Amino acid sequence: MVDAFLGTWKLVDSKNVDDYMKSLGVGFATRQVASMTKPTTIIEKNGDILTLKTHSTFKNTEISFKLGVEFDETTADDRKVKSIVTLDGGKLVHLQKWDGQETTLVRELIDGKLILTLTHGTAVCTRTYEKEA
Ligand SMILES: CCCCCCCCCCCCCCCC(=O)O
16 A cells, blocks of 8 residues: 555655765765755656656656565666565665665655655664645
8 A cells, every 4th residue: 555655745854864875985075965955756656566756956866666576776876776665564665785785765654744764884864755735
């Protein structure tokens, strides 16, 4: 059941994004611009295929996937990773693997807001998105 995640979402709060990017080895200039960027995330479904767009003034990404089926992904910071997205406890869990490393991108709905928690190493970033009508 993925349906409550679907729609267009705008960033309205961010904690520790610099820590997370730094852990991934993102350079200072990219971190600088990213810390000021407020992306729009669009999640749409067509049958079993989900498409997740992230749009901003800095970088844009798009992925399509089926839940529970691995896919190749090239992230906004240019990592080539092996990914899988699944539902766990009602949360949308996106796991990326590369070079023996892992990061998780966990999305949960709390009071109608979409909370994205990104973990790599010890770094934990929490970003809050609100739904656009
Ligand atoms: C597509 C906009 C990405 C802006 C950040 C660019 C540099 C760091 C990328 C780290 C991995 C992706 C982070 C996604 C954060 C989010 O969706 O709010």
